[PDB]
Design an enzyme around this catalytic site. Structure first.
Site, PDB file in Angstrom:
ATOM      1  N   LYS A 150       0.804  -1.215   0.000  1.00  0.00           N
ATOM      2  CA  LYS A 150       0.000   0.000   0.000  1.00  0.00           C
ATOM      3  C   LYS A 150       0.842   1.272   0.000  1.00  0.00           C
ATOM      4  O   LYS A 150       2.064   1.228   0.184  1.00  0.00           O
ATOM      5  CB  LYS A 150      -0.919   0.006   1.219  1.00  0.00           C
ATOM      6  CG  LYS A 150      -1.967  -1.108   1.248  1.00  0.00           C
ATOM      7  CD  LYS A 150      -2.786  -0.987   2.519  1.00  0.00           C
ATOM      8  CE  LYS A 150      -3.864  -2.041   2.632  1.00  0.00           C
ATOM      9  NZ  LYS A 150      -4.525  -1.981   3.974  1.00  0.00           N
TER      10      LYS A 150
ATOM     11  N   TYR B 107     -12.613  -2.515  -4.035  1.00  0.00           N
ATOM     12  CA  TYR B 107     -13.354  -2.577  -2.778  1.00  0.00           C
ATOM     13  C   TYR B 107     -14.859  -2.721  -2.969  1.00  0.00           C
ATOM     14  O   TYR B 107     -15.645  -2.258  -2.135  1.00  0.00           O
ATOM     15  CB  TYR B 107     -13.079  -1.331  -1.939  1.00  0.00           C
ATOM     16  CG  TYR B 107     -11.691  -1.295  -1.364  1.00  0.00           C
ATOM     17  CD1 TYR B 107     -11.267  -2.274  -0.459  1.00  0.00           C
ATOM     18  CD2 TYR B 107     -10.791  -0.299  -1.731  1.00  0.00           C
ATOM     19  CE1 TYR B 107      -9.978  -2.259   0.063  1.00  0.00           C
ATOM     20  CE2 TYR B 107      -9.501  -0.276  -1.216  1.00  0.00           C
ATOM     21  CZ  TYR B 107      -9.100  -1.257  -0.322  1.00  0.00           C
ATOM     22  OH  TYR B 107      -7.817  -1.242   0.170  1.00  0.00           O
TER      23      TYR B 107
ATOM     24  N   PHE C 129     -17.139   2.778   5.547  1.00  0.00           N
ATOM     25  CA  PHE C 129     -15.736   3.101   5.300  1.00  0.00           C
ATOM     26  C   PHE C 129     -15.278   2.901   3.861  1.00  0.00           C
ATOM     27  O   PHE C 129     -14.087   3.027   3.569  1.00  0.00           O
ATOM     28  CB  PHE C 129     -14.848   2.281   6.244  1.00  0.00           C
ATOM     29  CG  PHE C 129     -15.225   0.819   6.327  1.00  0.00           C
ATOM     30  CD1 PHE C 129     -15.009  -0.038   5.250  1.00  0.00           C
ATOM     31  CD2 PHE C 129     -15.815   0.305   7.481  1.00  0.00           C
ATOM     32  CE1 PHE C 129     -15.377  -1.382   5.323  1.00  0.00           C
ATOM     33  CE2 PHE C 129     -16.185  -1.036   7.563  1.00  0.00           C
ATOM     34  CZ  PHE C 129     -15.966  -1.879   6.482  1.00  0.00           C
TER      35      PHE C 129
ATOM     36  N   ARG D 275      -1.085 -14.543   4.666  1.00  0.00           N
ATOM     37  CA  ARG D 275      -1.853 -13.904   5.740  1.00  0.00           C
ATOM     38  C   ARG D 275      -1.088 -14.019   7.039  1.00  0.00           C
ATOM     39  O   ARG D 275      -0.983 -13.073   7.807  1.00  0.00           O
ATOM     40  CB  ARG D 275      -3.196 -14.607   5.932  1.00  0.00           C
ATOM     41  CG  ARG D 275      -4.396 -13.926   5.305  1.00  0.00           C
ATOM     42  CD  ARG D 275      -5.703 -14.409   5.962  1.00  0.00           C
ATOM     43  NE  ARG D 275      -6.760 -13.403   5.847  1.00  0.00           N
ATOM     44  CZ  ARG D 275      -6.693 -12.183   6.380  1.00  0.00           C
ATOM     45  NH1 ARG D 275      -5.619 -11.814   7.076  1.00  0.00           N
ATOM     46  NH2 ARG D 275      -7.686 -11.318   6.194  1.00  0.00           N
TER      47      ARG D 275
ATOM     48  N   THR E   5      -4.501  -7.642  11.608  1.00  0.00           N
ATOM     49  CA  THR E   5      -4.895  -6.379  11.005  1.00  0.00           C
ATOM     50  C   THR E   5      -4.343  -5.268  11.877  1.00  0.00           C
ATOM     51  O   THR E   5      -3.782  -4.299  11.382  1.00  0.00           O
ATOM     52  CB  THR E   5      -6.435  -6.268  10.916  1.00  0.00           C
ATOM     53  OG1 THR E   5      -6.920  -7.184   9.929  1.00  0.00           O
ATOM     54  CG2 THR E   5      -6.856  -4.861  10.531  1.00  0.00           C
TER      55      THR E   5
ATOM     56  N   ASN F 247      -1.474  -0.046   7.935  1.00  0.00           N
ATOM     57  CA  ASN F 247      -0.833  -1.332   8.177  1.00  0.00           C
ATOM     58  C   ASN F 247      -0.025  -1.901   7.012  1.00  0.00           C
ATOM     59  O   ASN F 247      -0.012  -3.111   6.787  1.00  0.00           O
ATOM     60  CB  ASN F 247      -1.850  -2.378   8.660  1.00  0.00           C
ATOM     61  CG  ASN F 247      -2.890  -2.723   7.613  1.00  0.00           C
ATOM     62  OD1 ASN F 247      -2.670  -2.545   6.411  1.00  0.00           O
ATOM     63  ND2 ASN F 247      -4.027  -3.243   8.066  1.00  0.00           N
TER      64      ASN F 247
ATOM     65  N   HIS G 128      -1.383  -5.779   2.144  1.00  0.00           N
ATOM     66  CA  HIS G 128      -2.673  -6.441   1.957  1.00  0.00           C
ATOM     67  C   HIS G 128      -2.492  -7.825   1.349  1.00  0.00           C
ATOM     68  O   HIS G 128      -1.628  -8.025   0.497  1.00  0.00           O
ATOM     69  CB  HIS G 128      -3.587  -5.647   1.023  1.00  0.00           C
ATOM     70  CG  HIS G 128      -4.603  -6.504   0.327  1.00  0.00           C
ATOM     71  ND1 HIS G 128      -5.616  -7.151   1.003  1.00  0.00           N
ATOM     72  CD2 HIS G 128      -4.705  -6.894  -0.967  1.00  0.00           C
ATOM     73  CE1 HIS G 128      -6.297  -7.903   0.154  1.00  0.00           C
ATOM     74  NE2 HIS G 128      -5.765  -7.766  -1.047  1.00  0.00           N
TER      75      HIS G 128
ATOM     76  N   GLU H 244      -9.180 -11.400  -7.202  1.00  0.00           N
ATOM     77  CA  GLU H 244      -8.283 -10.253  -7.149  1.00  0.00           C
ATOM     78  C   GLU H 244      -7.274 -10.340  -8.283  1.00  0.00           C
ATOM     79  O   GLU H 244      -6.982  -9.335  -8.924  1.00  0.00           O
ATOM     80  CB  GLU H 244      -7.542 -10.206  -5.807  1.00  0.00           C
ATOM     81  CG  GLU H 244      -8.251  -9.463  -4.681  1.00  0.00           C
ATOM     82  CD  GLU H 244      -7.723  -9.854  -3.305  1.00  0.00           C
ATOM     83  OE1 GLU H 244      -6.508 -10.079  -3.163  1.00  0.00           O
ATOM     84  OE2 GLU H 244      -8.522  -9.933  -2.353  1.00  0.00           O
TER      85      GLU H 244
END
Lengths: 149, 149, 149, 149, 149, 149
Positions: free
Chosen positions: A10, A50, A58, A86, A92, A113, A116, A127
């Protein structure tokens, strides 16, 4: 088998020069890079990303945020890359993640964070289909027989 | 100034898990990643990229080798990126490379010297035009005032 | 007390260039190196070692695999070396190994889980006698009074 | 061709915890390990190794130093290992060594310059057959075609 | 001998998360850390540190800069700390510093070359008396006999 | 919010050259360095830092310890710095310490567990007051918007 996962660095992770570090963790792990591109996410596309949350509150923030800075789009391969990706990434909440994980080491807040990861084989397949419609790079590591079998 | 250099991790660089190690090196330096993509090079493309050697004997091998495996094509921007970029990579022959440079630290032979870097800003633009006709991502690092001026 | 554990980097570990990384993990922890050798195991020996289960089915596989490539036999001393070494190595299944452990960070499958470590003080003593019948190297680290007490 | 060189981590290198660092430097370069062992050196042997200097005032000093603590004898193989092993280790005097070199980054005095490599191929072969009369472990890296040819 | 050199991590060095990196370079070297503090430089002091240049056109800029952010002031001890510090640090211009040096791997421009280092034994003595009038920390390294004598 | 935590590198951390490594962790995590000083502790002082254990039998050995070698006292700032500080440090007993934690990676015995950190925020304040009465350095990272919010 040889499943694949979508891993995304990110904006915050890019602004803080963490690209090499993240890619190195996956490289030494034995996983295979299949797709990588550095780019500016566009609004329309970000809503597409998203979408499973278009309902949620959000959502707008999510869209706006990922548009604020270029990201690094990746796809890795190997036994349990989705679940291990993961695990490698960590909780998270950085202050909840386990030491040794990416988020426990480089992040401080949920909203920043750093990375992803696809939370499932199917969401991964979706994805990958959204970020790499053009397809992926084919190749086989000469160390394959020492990583698998 | 806003000088750019085309840096590419050759196929052997990808097979030996050096992608993140190399990328961290240009990040920690303070250069900005302006473009990146993991791909499989096409034969016609390889030929053009090595056009200024079509006349030389080693041309074929050079092309057959550039296609033997996927590479990481990048563009880094920054004051003197081409020059120091070349300085960081080290001399063409590994054994002649200055200790501390990439080739001296990770390579043994010339036909397997892990990475390539533009050798002039002119060739830089010539290569950027070739590998990144679609353009580069744009962003502004927050560390910019502590890196420049 | 001063237990010793038998730590062995498996054939895949050697191929994947992880010999240094592994040894730097034990040196930094503060453990003492007592024995170390790069060697190609012979079947009769491979069989004695794994003889603890010459009865079982996969026995043949284990024997054939540890002979397929050179390994790094080592002996480490320190408080809780045996237990801590297994903790540092991580669970047998990479996908179950906790972040920060060698297996969690460098392996993918159980067949290629990169390294072996004594599983108890007794077995540790027996392996040390099997692999290092010639004894260990005696020395006194000047850093003792700073890592012990 | 693929020559070999005798590389030894002197007593001080072991005490300072550099066995890992050093090994990893060589593995990373792309050289292949052929023989390695942790050991104490008897005066008799230490004298054979430095026989070539028996007629020099500093001779006793040298002999008395390789016996003070265990060392790590190694045989590394690669194109130009001997000469690049020398460049990697750095000048005899730490304060004259080039940055990037092992002595430039890890040593202060000549008497404690951490490591030592063969100075010529003739001298390498000699030190190799003296330290490893029992032979070397053969194996072929699956990464060979990406380091050579 | 017991030479000391004043080493300072400038404002840009702190903002870029280099403190630990730099320190590890002097630590791994074998040099002894005798003083260290994270502080904000007051103008009057900056003028005293740069006094010997108080008549140069760039004096005000040099003063203003060092005041714009905290810095890490240190004192390192060891054989040839001054000159070797100068070597490790690198040439004034990052793009002229030898790969392997701090400026060669971390800086881009001169006005933000991440760190300062005394340029002569006498200057180091002044620098130390200026920033550490309160004295230094006293200790003997257990590894002393393995880096010296 | 922006809580602080007193983090101390004990005497054995200095002797063992872990200063740079340890600091680099907090910087890489995203926490802010607010105070730092390499120093020798005075007995009457150590007694007050360990006041909460003066009734206990090991208080004497506890004080004589941090008084035997210089330490590096620091104050770090960030969300949940106390909790994460403790997690990163790891269980006080190294062999119970989770893999990936400073202690699980660098320590062996309790009396030599390398580092100390506030166990609550009100104790952080007790410590910051004691060790840093003159206050802390103020500054604002340029990466702030990318770490928080």
């Amino acid at each position: 088998r040889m499943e694949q996962s979508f891993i995304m660095i990110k904006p915050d992770g890019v602004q803080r020069g963490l690209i090499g570090d993240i890619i190195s963790r996956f490289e030494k792990k034995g996983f295979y890079l299949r797709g990588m591109k550095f780019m500016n996410v566009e609004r329309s596309f970000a809503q597409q990303h998203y979408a499973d949350l278009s309902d949620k509150p959000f959502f707008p923030g999510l869209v706006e945020y990922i548009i604020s800075g270029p990201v690094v789009a990746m796809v890795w391969e190997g036994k349990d890359v989705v679940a291990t990706g993961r695990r490698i990434i960590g909780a998270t909440r950085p202050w909840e993640a386990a030491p040794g994980t990416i988020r426990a080491d480089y992040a401080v807040e949920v909203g920043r964070n750093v990375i992803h990861g696809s939370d499932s084989v199917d969401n991964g397949k979706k994805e990958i289909a959204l970020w790499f419609p053009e397809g992926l790079a084919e190749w086989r590591s000469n160390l394959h027989p020492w990583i698998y079998e």
